[PDB]
Copies of this chain bind each other. A is one copy, B any other.
Amino acid sequence: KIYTKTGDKGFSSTFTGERRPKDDQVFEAVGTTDELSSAIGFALELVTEKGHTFAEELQKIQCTLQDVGSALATPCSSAREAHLKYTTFKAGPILELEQWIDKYTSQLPPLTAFILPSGGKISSALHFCRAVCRRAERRVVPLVQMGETDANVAKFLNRLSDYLFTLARYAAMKEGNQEKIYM
């Protein structure tokens, strides 16, 4: 059977084998990363045409988010206690995001003021993804400040926020949609 029922009393396992209540910050961080990945999946379902580079990029990002969830599930202090290795989150994906950000940023008109979330279906979906990503970042920061998670995880999520904002503007520009401003 797909379920075990071992979590019916409200406890679950980390990747170090330690059992904690399901409201622990480790599970809040893992679950919010999962929620971000799901929002990105639904946004991916909105692309009308085929062969879009940024769709491949978003799928790569989803895989990286699975890796980020795995990292968050192995707290470093319990990995030292459990005799396990370090759980080092590498910087590759961050640099990749920075490259893609430069690519899209070089193509947009300069932006000076606040944007209302808008610009077509894809663009609005990506703005919602951006807000969920920032929530995930806020869930990861306390774990970093405790020494439980590599700081590169928070760096990746922070850079993904900017990637999603820039990609929303890029999609809006390509659709001929103008986004709104003011008060």
- Residues in chain A within 8 A of chain B (CB atoms): 1-3, 5, 7-10, 21-24, 27-28, 31-32, 34-35, 37-42, 44-45, 59, 62-64, 66-67, 98, 101-102, 105, 114, 116-118, 120-121, 124-125, 127-128, 130-132, 134-135, 137-139, 141-142, 144-145, 151, 154-155, 158-159, 162, 165-166, 180, 182-183
A140 nearest in chain B by CB position: B10
A24 nearest in chain B by CB position: B138
Q: List residues of chain B with CB within 8 A of the CB of A98.
A: 3
A183 touches B66 (CB 8 A): yes
Interface of A: prevailing SS:
helix
Q: A24-B138, A183-B63 are in contact. Are A8 and B154 (CB under 8 A)?
A: yes
Q: List residues of chain B with CB within 8 A of the CB of A117.
A: 34, 37-38, 40-42, 62
Q: List residues of chain B with CB within 8 A of the CB of A154.
A: 8-10
Cross-interface CB contact of A10 among B5, B40, B144, cutoff 8 Å: B144
Q: List residues of chain B with CB within 8 A of the CB of A118.
A: 41, 44-45
Q: How far is the CA of A31 from the CA of B159 in the complex (A)?
A: 16
A117 nearest in chain B by CB position: B41
* Closest CB pairs A-B (n = 10): A41-B117, A35-B131, A10-B141, A42-B124, A38-B128, A38-B117, A38-B127, A41-B124, A63-B182, A8-B155
Q: List residues of chain B with CB within 8 A of the CB of A7.
A: 158
Q: A3-B159, A142-B21 are in contact. Are A134 and B62 (CB under 8 A)?
A: no
A62 touches B116 (CB 8 A): yes
A59 touches B180 (CB 8 A): yes
Question: Would you give 15 A-B contacts (Cβ < 8 Å), ordered by A?
Answer: A2-B105, A2-B166, A7-B158, A8-B154, A9-B154, A31-B134, A34-B117, A35-B135, A38-B117, A41-B118, A41-B124, A45-B124, A62-B116, A63-B116, A66-B182
